[PDB]
């Protein structure tokens, strides 16, 4: 088929969501602007051919609020209106995902950088540029 | 490293880890990070000197304590993440001398190897002469002895 | 089992508007010679020569598998490069990449399915060695070639030329039940059960193994002990 | 043997090592390294065994078979050996090394679990930690094995607890379905038989 | 690809000849072990659109004790045979005075015709086999011991000797390849002779259910 | 062969998609969102290297010479500046199918030359 | 005829087998109870060996009965032991190895 799509299981949401929808809902209209948070060097094609099948999954949404509704439909408390799903999904993106990067009036660019770092960190292991983390490594314990 | 060895701003518990191949550089400040103290090694020589041992041997008069030894920039606290990006030596005599060269880029040394043991395993005499499932059974039966 | 992915080096698709136009510089196409979007694959010599394949066999497998919806054009086995080109005879070109993936994942160029890795060695143990009887009534352990696998089909295997259909055991009891029957399952179960006991060198009497294999098979079906 | 490890490593680094058929380069390198180390341990063990006197008290038990084995004497006197985890050597628990006292990408004997010291000579601390890591695996397997073997025991018994030899000398279950027509397909009990040799065969 | 199909049909015919000899139908030693060359010369080497096509190579045989009960086989041309392509065969059955036969299909049979084979079964006790199934005489394998079909007068003597009922025996299901090989209904017991490593030879009795 | 690179719409900054001009029979890249189109210069669209013979030397970074944990030899001097110290290490990569090749990186900073023997 | 039966029962020929009473040890006990001295010619007539083994094989019953279904099972149940017994209580083997009276 197409192969190797990227999704994002995020809390208080019943179903996984493709990451491009998450960056569109998070505040980024464009595609190059989304891609600048994930692939830090655009002259690497091997990143590009792996990142494009999840981009081609979601060229039907190009604006923020439709992606907000796409999240809020999947919500644990599914809103009945268009403007209740948006408030629920905006609450989730504001507070539920990634508290450690900031919960404030505007922390969307910083949360976007950390999420793009997570996607980049996934792509490096899927390409074998790095190695997988060990669960028993007691540096990773507290 | 210059600041943490002087305790200017960065307290000793904070860990700095530079990953080189992956360009990331992390700093951790949290609670729950397990760490142990190590000596510091410049070019091939210890930062610990005769004068430190002399000032600290006549403790209870000078009170040149462990904390003054930390403050001098002679020991560090190293946790597990920072222990991956570093090169240690077991014994400064046998491992920092001219020979068929192994590393010659050491960074730290250990104070004594017998500080890898615990409490109940630190009462076993000659434990490196036993088979290792015996040291476990003695580390269990040391909690059951009468005294 | 061998797919196209084992032998191919890389795959690149071009949109070449005329088949004679040849964006790739290959004179073999020019002497060799309707849709413009084409697929090109480079194989490698090593896996091709290890398994002894020819591009005629491969193109035959494509034309058998997909029919005459599409035509392969293959290099003769003389040049350093191992190229073949693919068109589609007359949902535009994502279909081409889709059938690329479907063609890569499974074609069975050689081999049979579910058997992924097969080994070869000469057996040292006398039971695994072939045993005959000579003219003077000796036993004369023979050291012939055997070959062990990593998957199992056992009925597509036995139904082949030059494979011994008397001696091939298959380590898998449900399959022996499907193929050889319940009385073969009792003997095979006994052998696979005695093997793990005698691997330590310990001994257990035939009484107990025989009774376990009997109670486990005395109803015509596999009575698993659960 | 330790020099023969290093020359194999040099043949591996300079791409001078051809893979064994049926194996990858990694597994054939591992096979050759473990071959040198096991042959070393065996030769040192045999030298130790040749060294012992008639009046020895380790030999007094091993020859009698009362306690110990021929590998224990070698492992007390000569060489402990290589410590293994899941059949392989000591794995790279750190980033491409084992302990922070070793250079990265060190496939040597001392860096991966081989103990060139005996129990009489004591262990170096690296070797001590590796031997603890070796003993831990068997100490785990002891505790893990019991809760499977007892369950297999009980589950085997519940299928066959009513199977007995009747006065027909046949073998039948609780509902008199016949399992064997003679017990052990000979009628004979297991505690009165022996090993013998068929003379007329071969 | 005609040498492989010729070799395949030769092994099919050879296994059917061993099938009919083991079952009891009278077949000669000439057909029992012929080489590939008698097959190739006597059917014609070209299975693709040529002389050794199906249906006019199909075997009919007769039982040894009387030449009244007769056993066809039929090798259909279709990969997946159907009801309309077996009622032809059943018409050949009712055309003759014969009772039963084999059908060696090429691919898997359709379920509706399998239910058909179930339905006229007490009239005509016929059955099928598969092509992949029949490229090996599985009786020749070393795991498979010697199976013998018991006569009813011997079954009565068996049950009288050990003083036990017909359901107390060990049993065998009708669908496994050995009982399907000999071809036997339920309520019919089978000797199994096998070598014992403890005491010589051992006979047991499986009842078809 | 080479590797295909994604190019972007100038107008709305989205991924262009390949498409065939049937009339001129020419490959063109077109945006889904806006009508902007472009002529293809490469004519290669999807390339997939399955044997995946990869050059690790593109991925190696010169800063790795600052790692204390890594070994170094003076047996192999630098190819560019002829400096003796070279820090060496293995592939350090998963799916490096069978490789114990040593990669050498030069010390003595701002050289950064990287080679394989 | 028994030798070929063993060769078909035991492919990959291994003489080691499990059987009730150790005949070699029992013969060697008989040699010490009765003071054999195997340097002298034997008193035992070799037809008595044959008709003693044939009678002993009658005495060793597993399946009782006389109908031919029981006799086949008695023959099969004692098959390997009777092969071993006829193979070690020969007339040649008693007359030239064990020298029993
Ligand atoms: Zn656009
Ligand atoms: Zn340089």
TrEMBL record, chain A:
Leader peptide range in chain numbering: none
Subcellular location(s) per record: Nucleus
Segments forming domain RNA polymerase Rpb2: 1-142
Domain of life: Eukaryota
Function: RNA-dependent RNA polymerase that catalyzes the extension of a non-coding RNA (ncRNA) at the 3'-end using the four ribonucleoside triphosphates as substrates. An internal ncRNA sequence near the 3'-end serves as a template in a single-round Pol II-mediated RNA polymerization reaction. May decrease the stability of ncRNAs that repress Pol II-mediated gene transcription. DNA-dependent RNA polymerase catalyzes the transcription of DNA into RNA using the four ribonucleoside triphosphates as substrates.
Family statement drawn from the similarity comment of this UniProt entry: Belongs to the RNA polymerase beta chain family.
Protein name (database record): DNA-directed RNA polymerase subunit beta
Protein species of origin: Sus scrofa
Upper classification of the organism: Eukaryota, Metazoa, Chordata, Craniata, Vertebrata
Gene encoding the protein: POLR2B
Residues included from the entire protein: 377 to 518 of 1300
TrEMBL record, chain E:
GO molecular function: DNA binding; DNA-directed RNA polymerase activity
GO biological process, one term: transcription elongation by RNA polymerase I
Gene3D superfamilies given in the database record: RNA polymerase, Rpb5, N-terminal domain, RPB5-like RNA polymerase subunit
SUPFAM superfamilies the UniProt entry points to: Eukaryotic RPB5 N-terminal domain (SSF53036), RPB5-like RNA polymerase subunit (SSF55287)
Keywords per UniProt: DNA-directed RNA polymerase, Nucleus, Transcription
Annotated ranges, domain RNA polymerase subunit H/Rpb5 C-terminal: 136-208
Broad class of where this protein is predominantly found: nucleus
GO cellular component: RNA polymerase I complex; RNA polymerase II, core complex; RNA polymerase III complex
Compartment annotation: Nucleus
Entry similarity comment: Belongs to the archaeal Rpo5/eukaryotic RPB5 RNA polymerase subunit family.
NCBIfam families the record matches: PRK09570.1
Name used for this protein in its record: DNA-directed RNA polymerases I, II, and III subunit RPABC1
Native species: Sus scrofa (Pig)
């Amino acid at each position: 088929a197409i192969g190797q799509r990227i999704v994002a299981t995020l809390p208080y949401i019943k179903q996984e969501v493709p990451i491009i929808i998450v960056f569109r809902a998070l505040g980024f209209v464009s595609d190059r602007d989304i891609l600048e948070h994930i692939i830090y060097d655009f002259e690497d094609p091997e990143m590009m051919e792996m990142v494009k099948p999840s981009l081609d999954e979601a060229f039907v949404i190009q604006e923020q609020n439709v992606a907000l509704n796409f999240i809020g439909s999947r919500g644990a408390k599914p809103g009945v209106t268009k403007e209740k799903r948006i408030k629920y999904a905006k609450e989730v993106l504001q507070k539920e995902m990634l508290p450690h990067v900031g919960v404030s009036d505007f922390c969307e660019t910083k949360k976007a950088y950390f999420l793009g770092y997570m996607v980049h960190r996934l792509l490096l292991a899927a390409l074998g540029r790095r190695e997988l983390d060990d669960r028993d490594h007691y540096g990773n314990k507290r | 490293r210059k600041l943490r060895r002087q305790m200017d701003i960065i307290v000793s518990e904070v860990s700095m880890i530079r990953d080189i191949r992956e360009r990331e550089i992390r700093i951790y400040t949290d609670a729950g990070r397990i760490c142990r103290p190590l000596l510091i090694v410049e070019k091939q020589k210890l930062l610990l000197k005769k004068r430190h041992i002399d000032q600290l041997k006549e403790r209870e008069y000078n009170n040149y304590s462990w904390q003054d030894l930390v403050a001098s920039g002679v020991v560090e606290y190293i946790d597990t993440l920072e222990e991956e990006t570093v090169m240690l030596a077991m014994t400064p005599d046998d491992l920092q001398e001219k020979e068929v060269a192994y590393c010659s880029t050491y960074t730290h040394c250990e104070i004594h190897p017998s500080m890898i043991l615990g409490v109940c395993a630190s009462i076993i005499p000659f434990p490196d002469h036993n088979q290792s499932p015996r040291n476990t059974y003695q580390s269990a039966m040391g909690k059951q002895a009468m005294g | 089992h061998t797919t196209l992915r084992k032998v191919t080096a890389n795959t690149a698709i071009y949109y070449d508007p005329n088949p004679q136009s040849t964006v790739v510089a290959e004179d073999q196409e020019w002497v060799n010679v309707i849709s413009p979007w084409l697929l090109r694959v480079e194989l490698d010599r090593k896996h091709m020569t290890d398994r002894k394949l020819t591009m005629e066999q491969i193109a035959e497998k494509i034309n058998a598998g997909f029919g005459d919806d599409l035509n392969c054009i293959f290099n003769d086995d003389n040049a350093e490069k191992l190229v073949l080109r693919i068109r589609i005879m007359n949902d535009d070109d994502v279909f081409l990449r889709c059938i690329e993936s479907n063609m890569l994942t499974d074609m069975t160029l050689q081999g049979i399915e579910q058997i992924s890795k097969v080994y070869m060695h000469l057996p040292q143990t006398d039971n695994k060695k072939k045993i005959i009887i000579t003219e003077d009534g000796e036993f004369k352990a023979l050291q012939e070639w055997i070959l062990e696998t990593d998957g199992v089909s056992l009925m597509r295997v036995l139904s082949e030329k030059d494979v011994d259909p008397v001696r091939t055991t298959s380590n898998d009891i449900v399959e022996i039940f499907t193929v050889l029957g319940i009385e073969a399952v009792r003997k095979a179960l006994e052998r696979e059960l005695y093997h793990v006991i005698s691997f330590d060198g310990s001994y257990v009497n035939y009484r107990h193994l025989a009774l376990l294999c009997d109670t486990m098979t005395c109803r015509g079906h596999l009575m698993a002990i659960t | 043997a330790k020099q023969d490890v290093i020359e194999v490593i040099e043949k591996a680094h300079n791409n001078e090592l051809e893979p064994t058929p049926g194996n990858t380069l990694r597994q054939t390198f591992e096979n050759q390294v473990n071959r040198i180390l096991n042959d070393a341990r065996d030769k040192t063990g045999s030298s130790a065994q040749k060294s012992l006197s008639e009046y020895n008290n380790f030999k007094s038990m091993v020859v009698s078979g009362a306690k110990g084995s021929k590998i224990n004497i070698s492992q007390v006197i000569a060489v402990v050996g290589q410590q293994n985890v899941e059949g392989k050597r000591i794995p790279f628990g750190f980033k491409h090394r084992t302990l922070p006292h070793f250079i990265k990408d060190d496939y040597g004997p001392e860096s991966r679990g081989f103990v060139e010291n005996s129990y009489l000579a004591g262990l170096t601390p690296t070797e001590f930690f590796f031997h603890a890591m070796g003993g831990r695996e068997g100490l785990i397997d002891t505790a893990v094995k019991t809760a499977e073997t007892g369950y297999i025991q009980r589950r085997l018994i519940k299928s066959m607890e009513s199977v007995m030899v009747k006065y027909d000398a046949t073998v039948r279950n609780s509902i008199n379905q016949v399992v064997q027509l003679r017990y052990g397909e000979d009628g004979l009990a297991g505690e009165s038989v022996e090993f013998q040799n068929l003379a007329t065969l071969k | 690809d005609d040498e492989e199909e010729t070799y395949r049909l030769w092994k099919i015919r050879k296994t059917i000849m061993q099938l009919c000899h083991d079952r009891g139908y009278l077949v000669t030693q000439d057909e029992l072990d012929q080489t590939l060359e008698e097959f190739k010369a006597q059917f014609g080497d070209k299975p693709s659109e040529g002389r050794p096509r199906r249906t006019d190579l199909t075997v009919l045989v007769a039982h040894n004790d009387d030449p009244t009960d007769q056993m066809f086989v039929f090798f259909p041309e279709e990969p997946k045979v159907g009801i309309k392509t077996i009622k032809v065969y059943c018409q050949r059955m009712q055309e003759e005075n014969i009772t039963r036969a084999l059908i060696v299909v090429q691919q898997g049979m359709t379920p509706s015709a399998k239910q058909s084979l179930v339905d006229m079964a007490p009239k005509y006790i016929l059955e099928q086999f598969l092509q992949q199934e029949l490229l090996i005489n599985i009786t020749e394998h070393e795991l498979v011991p010697e199976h013998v079909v018991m006569t009813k007068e011997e079954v009565t003597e068996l049950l009288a000797r050990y003083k036990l009922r017909e359901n107390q025996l060990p049993r065998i299901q009708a669908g496994d390849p050995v009982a399907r090989y000999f071809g036997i209904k339920r309520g019919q017991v089978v000797k199994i002779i096998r070598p014992s490593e403890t005491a010589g030879r051992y006979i047991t009795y499986r009842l078809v259910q | 062969p080479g590797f295909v690179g994604i190019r972007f719409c100038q107008e709305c900054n989205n991924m262009l998609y390949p498409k065939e001009d049937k009339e001129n029979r020419i490959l063109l890249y077109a945006c889904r969102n806006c009508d902007y189109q472009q002529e293809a210069d490469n004519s290669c669209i999807y390339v997939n290297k399955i044997t995946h013979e990869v050059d690790e030397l593109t991925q190696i970074i010169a800063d790795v010479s600052q790692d204390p944990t890594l070994p170094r030899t003076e047996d192999h001097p630098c190819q560019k500046c002829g400096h003796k110290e070279a820090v060496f290490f293995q592939s350090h990569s998963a799916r490096a199918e069978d490789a114990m090749r040593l990669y050498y990186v030069c010390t003595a900073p701002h050289c950064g030359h990287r080679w394989t023997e | 005829e028994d030798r070929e039966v063993l060769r078909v029962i035991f492919p990959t020929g291994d003489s080691k087998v499990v059987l009730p009473c150790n005949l070699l040890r029992m013969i060697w006990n008989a040699q010490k109870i009765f003071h054999i001295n195997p340097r002298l010619p034997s008193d035992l007539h070799p037809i008595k060996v044959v008709e003693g083994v044939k009678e002993l094989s009658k005495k060793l019953v597993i399946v009782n009965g006389d109908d031919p279904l029981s006799r086949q099972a008695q023959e099969n149940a004692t098959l390997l032991f009777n092969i071993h017994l006829r193979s070690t209580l020969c007339s040649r083997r008693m007359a030239e190895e064990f020298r029993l009276s």
